[PDB]
Design an enzyme around this catalytic site. Structure first.
Site, PDB file in Angstrom:
ATOM      1  N   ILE B  40       0.846  -1.187   0.000  1.00  0.00           N
ATOM      2  CA  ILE B  40       0.000   0.000   0.000  1.00  0.00           C
ATOM      3  C   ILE B  40       0.881   1.237   0.000  1.00  0.00           C
ATOM      4  O   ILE B  40       0.418   2.347   0.253  1.00  0.00           O
ATOM      5  CB  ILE B  40      -0.930   0.064   1.244  1.00  0.00           C
ATOM      6  CG1 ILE B  40      -0.096   0.140   2.526  1.00  0.00           C
ATOM      7  CG2 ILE B  40      -1.856  -1.138   1.269  1.00  0.00           C
ATOM      8  CD1 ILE B  40      -0.880   0.610   3.732  1.00  0.00           C
ATOM      9  N   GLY B  43       8.767   3.544  -0.667  1.00  0.00           N
ATOM     10  CA  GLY B  43       9.671   4.669  -0.543  1.00  0.00           C
ATOM     11  C   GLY B  43      11.072   4.221  -0.898  1.00  0.00           C
ATOM     12  O   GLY B  43      11.309   3.033  -1.133  1.00  0.00           O
ATOM     13  N   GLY B  46      11.978   1.539   1.778  1.00  0.00           N
ATOM     14  CA  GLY B  46      11.355   0.225   1.813  1.00  0.00           C
ATOM     15  C   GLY B  46       9.936   0.154   1.278  1.00  0.00           C
ATOM     16  O   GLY B  46       9.548   0.928   0.400  1.00  0.00           O
ATOM     17  N   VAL B  47       9.158  -0.781   1.815  1.00  0.00           N
ATOM     18  CA  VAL B  47       7.779  -0.968   1.389  1.00  0.00           C
ATOM     19  C   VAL B  47       6.798  -1.028   2.552  1.00  0.00           C
ATOM     20  O   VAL B  47       7.087  -1.616   3.593  1.00  0.00           O
ATOM     21  CB  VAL B  47       7.627  -2.266   0.588  1.00  0.00           C
ATOM     22  CG1 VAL B  47       6.192  -2.415   0.108  1.00  0.00           C
ATOM     23  CG2 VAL B  47       8.590  -2.263  -0.580  1.00  0.00           C
ATOM     24  N   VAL B  48       5.633  -0.417   2.361  1.00  0.00           N
ATOM     25  CA  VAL B  48       4.591  -0.416   3.374  1.00  0.00           C
ATOM     26  C   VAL B  48       3.484  -1.361   2.912  1.00  0.00           C
ATOM     27  O   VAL B  48       2.893  -1.162   1.851  1.00  0.00           O
ATOM     28  CB  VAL B  48       4.000   0.994   3.574  1.00  0.00           C
ATOM     29  CG1 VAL B  48       3.028   0.991   4.738  1.00  0.00           C
ATOM     30  CG2 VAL B  48       5.116   1.992   3.821  1.00  0.00           C
ATOM     31  N   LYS B  63       5.501  -1.105   7.895  1.00  0.00           N
ATOM     32  CA  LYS B  63       6.553  -0.375   7.200  1.00  0.00           C
ATOM     33  C   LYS B  63       7.855  -1.159   7.336  1.00  0.00           C
ATOM     34  O   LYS B  63       8.417  -1.282   8.424  1.00  0.00           O
ATOM     35  CB  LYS B  63       6.707   1.039   7.787  1.00  0.00           C
ATOM     36  CG  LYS B  63       7.753   1.904   7.090  1.00  0.00           C
ATOM     37  CD  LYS B  63       7.734   3.341   7.603  1.00  0.00           C
ATOM     38  CE  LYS B  63       8.747   4.213   6.864  1.00  0.00           C
ATOM     39  NZ  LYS B  63       8.586   5.667   7.163  1.00  0.00           N
ATOM     40  N   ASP B 159       9.360  16.747   7.525  1.00  0.00           N
ATOM     41  CA  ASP B 159       8.790  16.299   6.251  1.00  0.00           C
ATOM     42  C   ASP B 159       7.260  16.388   6.242  1.00  0.00           C
ATOM     43  O   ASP B 159       6.576  15.467   5.792  1.00  0.00           O
ATOM     44  CB  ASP B 159       9.232  14.863   5.946  1.00  0.00           C
ATOM     45  CG  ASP B 159       8.988  14.465   4.483  1.00  0.00           C
ATOM     46  OD1 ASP B 159       8.841  15.362   3.609  1.00  0.00           O
ATOM     47  OD2 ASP B 159       8.945  13.245   4.211  1.00  0.00           O
TER      48      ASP B 159
HETATM   49  N1  LIG Z   1      -0.444   3.501   9.156  1.00  0.00           N
HETATM   50  C1  LIG Z   1      -0.654   3.576   7.844  1.00  0.00           C
HETATM   51  N2  LIG Z   1      -1.882   3.233   7.367  1.00  0.00           N
HETATM   52  C2  LIG Z   1      -2.163   3.288   6.051  1.00  0.00           C
HETATM   53  N3  LIG Z   1      -1.354   3.656   5.074  1.00  0.00           N
HETATM   54  C3  LIG Z   1       0.020   4.055   5.483  1.00  0.00           C
HETATM   55  C4  LIG Z   1       0.400   4.012   6.922  1.00  0.00           C
HETATM   56  N4  LIG Z   1       1.708   4.407   7.148  1.00  0.00           N
HETATM   57  C5  LIG Z   1       2.030   4.659   5.838  1.00  0.00           C
HETATM   58  N5  LIG Z   1       1.100   4.483   4.786  1.00  0.00           N
HETATM   59  C6  LIG Z   1       1.192   4.696   3.315  1.00  0.00           C
HETATM   60  O1  LIG Z   1       2.541   4.510   2.840  1.00  0.00           O
HETATM   61  C7  LIG Z   1       3.063   5.761   2.315  1.00  0.00           C
HETATM   62  C8  LIG Z   1       4.534   5.763   2.674  1.00  0.00           C
HETATM   63  O2  LIG Z   1       4.675   5.640   4.119  1.00  0.00           O
HETATM   64  P1  LIG Z   1       5.820   6.456   4.892  1.00  0.00           P
HETATM   65  O3  LIG Z   1       5.742   6.142   6.373  1.00  0.00           O
HETATM   66  O4  LIG Z   1       5.631   7.948   4.609  1.00  0.00           O
HETATM   67  O5  LIG Z   1       7.219   5.911   4.217  1.00  0.00           O
HETATM   68  P2  LIG Z   1       8.293   6.722   3.325  1.00  0.00           P
HETATM   69  O6  LIG Z   1       7.849   8.184   3.138  1.00  0.00           O
HETATM   70  O7  LIG Z   1       9.669   6.702   3.994  1.00  0.00           O
HETATM   71  O8  LIG Z   1       8.369   6.040   1.944  1.00  0.00           O
HETATM   72  C9  LIG Z   1       2.211   6.859   3.006  1.00  0.00           C
HETATM   73  O9  LIG Z   1       2.254   8.173   2.445  1.00  0.00           O
HETATM   74  C10 LIG Z   1       0.847   6.179   3.044  1.00  0.00           C
HETATM   75  O10 LIG Z   1       0.058   6.380   1.866  1.00  0.00           O
HETATM   76 MG   LIG Z   2       6.004   9.765   3.103  1.00  0.00          MG
END
Ligand SMILES: Nc1ncnc2c1ncn2[C@@H]1O[C@H](COP(=O)(O)OP(=O)(O)O)[C@@H](O)[C@H]1O
Ligand SMILES: [Mg+2]
Ligand SMILES: Nc1ncnc2c1ncn2[C@@H]1O[C@H](COP(=O)(O)OP(=O)(O)O)[C@@H](O)[C@H]1O
Ligand SMILES: [Mg+2]
EC number: 2.7.11.26
Lengths: 354, 364
Positions: B40, B43, B46-48, B63, B159
């Protein structure tokens, strides 16, 4: 058929203004600083672009000053310039009358991108070689463009001629004099700039040029990122983590030294398999962490990747001959005269005295 | 350095069982099993993923980030000490061996939130509509509360942007996320200026200052507010100079003194002398005057001149949220807005006389 007549000063030569009339004025763009229109010169019917910018009465325009001294086949020509008033107030506008060029590397590249097609390497060679020639030229005057990007590279698709434009960020760089690190568009910014250095050199244009080459080869920007951190992570993914000396070379100041130790990603695995090895090799020599380690524009022009252009039988895909590519001047070759041996091939510019 | 256990509960359903460390409570490892893992997010780090907890059926986000065996993870260390209703919760974390090499991955298990201010704003933008101001009020207020909280610990997010603001549409709850750039700012200590996303960068960052404060988060929040009101980013630009031009167009040319306030080092002082742009002319007609006033107090050149998050919360633009009869458009109750803690108020305790409305003080 509304005709506009102005008394404009020739871009180059003596300050001897002449009456110039034009018509068919239609907006063809905008800028944070002003609008760009297209018009047709009544006398010649030639098309030109008029870049209109708000001018500070109390100071002289740096862009204008720089344009007035440039004269190269790969740089957009300043035909005339004149002043007009902005009724909105006692506001005065500087109007730059430039040669009109139909396309940009940006639009052309976007076409191939959308069509899920690769821009033929012959054009990648043609466009990049001409960009390097324009950089060798301005750099020989100590002038750094500071905003090299696809949108600032004008193109005439039929002739395959490229013309560098937009000298709104250009500046003569003087060793020891600090300069702002916030110039240059995201994606094309040299690492030392992201790291906030103020003692950078003209080699920041070479990094920018390298980003354009890779993007034309890849079909998309090579170092995207919405933040400086993201951009650096993309750079590190390809070049590997910068050495302590390399970091020192870019900007011996920035604190954060916390950055994932990634091994250099084999430049060959970066591009599609069909990609010419010379293109990859040239790339690795432009996109280098240590500013001084990057090829100079003239050296880039002499690179093997451009050997096809020096072939006497080369032709454009449309059947036409290639545009001017070897009319080097002493000024242009000044950074390394001996390169003329490579840059001007045996068959080029051969002319007797009757 | 840990491991997992994959199996198939039933119907071929793949179940992953891991032993995770509680995010906030004491170190009592617990077994966690989940299914239906789907990406979902993504970055440079990594991957969320989205996953469903096997028993509760609860959805969560995971995350996954590459962990440097060199030092400790700053994001994890920061997330572990945070406990606020407007900050995404770290349920637990665990390490997993990247089958790619001797690489270890840190996995942060967070509460799952369905939307982001970024997506919602884009939905309205496409339909050429604007988010009802009541939501703008609710979201921004909650953002300022989360900022008042992390700042009280000296932590700067660095950020703030629409994509890092999670939203639950039905409850109208907003939760700040992504502490991957967060850092405790210590006066006298230099910090990098290449953090923060283009469009939301404070001018002192654009000018390359390394002595900035938490007030850069306030500038960023101001950009979000202005953007939610305008329907598009207020200070776009592909280069720093373009961004500064857009800023100057609205704020006017910065005085030599204001420049000194952001960064007393950068050279270029050569910038068109534009007059201050009437903020009222910046937004569409009928935009609440209080909203425009708040923007102007957030988007200030001089860092110390910007309102603090707690002061922003007390601004009159949010008065409607303090009305005893305020309700969500869907007839539902607004989320918790006045359960301030001592920590949260530490920056200016007396502000509570405004922040906590009379009706919220009723014994009952
Ligand atoms: N708790 C969460 N629930 C749902 N979606 C999330 C959540 N945490 C992150 N995401 C999704 O993943 C994207 C990237 O997460 P993030 O923590 O900002 O990682 P990064 O910015 O380092 O790539 C977010 O902008 C969001 O759309
Ligand atoms: Mg982000
Ligand atoms: N000589 C020209 N011929 C045709 N189009 C031009 C010319 N000069 C500029 N343009 C168009 O106008 C845009 C803005 O011009 P530019 O010189 O780059 O001003 P800015 O300072 O806003 O970048 C260009 O990117 C280009 O598409
Ligand atoms: Mg341009």
């Amino acid at each position: 058929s509304k005709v506009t007549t102005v008394v404009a000063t020739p871009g180059q030569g003596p300050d001897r203004p002449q009456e110039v009339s034009y018509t068919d004025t239609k907006v063809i763009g905008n800028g944070s600083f002003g609008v760009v229109y297209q018009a047709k010169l009544c006398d010649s019917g030639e098309l030109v672009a008029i870049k209109k910018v708000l001018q500070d009465k109390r100071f002289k325009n740096r862009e204008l000053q720089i344009m007035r001294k440039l004269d190269h086949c790969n740089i957009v020509r300043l035909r005339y310039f004149f002043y007009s008033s902005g009724e909105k107030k006692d506001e005065v506008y500087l109007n730059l009358v430039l040669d009109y060029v139909p396309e940009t590397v940006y639009r052309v590249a976007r076409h191939y991108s959308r069509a899920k097609q690769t821009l033929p390497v012959i054009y990648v060679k043609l466009y990049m070689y001409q960009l390097f020639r324009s950089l060798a030229y301005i750099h020989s005057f100590g002038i750094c463009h500071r905003d090299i990007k696809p949108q600032n590279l004008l193109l005439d698709p039929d002739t395959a001629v490229l013309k560098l434009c937009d000298f709104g960020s250009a500046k003569q760089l003087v060793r020891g004099e600090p300069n702002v690190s916030y110039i240059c568009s995201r994606y094309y910014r040299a690492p030392e700039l992201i790291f906030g250095a103020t003692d950078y050199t003209s080699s920041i244009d070479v990094w920018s040029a390298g980003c354009v080459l890779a993007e034309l080869l890849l079909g998309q920007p090579i170092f995207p990122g919405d933040s400086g951190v993201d951009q650096l992570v993309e750079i590190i993914k390809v070049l590997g983590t910068p050495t302590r000396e390399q970091i020192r070379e870019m900007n011996p100041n920035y604190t954060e030294f916390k950055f994932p130790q990634i091994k250099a990603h084999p430049w060959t695995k970066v591009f599609r398999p069909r990609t010419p090895p010379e293109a990859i090799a040239l790339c690795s020599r432009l996109l280098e962490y240590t500013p001084t380690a990057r090829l100079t524009p003239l050296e880039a022009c002499a690179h093997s990747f451009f050997d096809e252009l020096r072939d006497p039988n080369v032709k454009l895909p449309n059947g036409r001959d290639t545009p001017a590519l070897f009319n080097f001047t002493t000024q242009e070759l000044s950074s390394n005269p001996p390169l003329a041996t490579i840059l001007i091939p045996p068959h080029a510019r051969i002319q007797a005295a009757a």
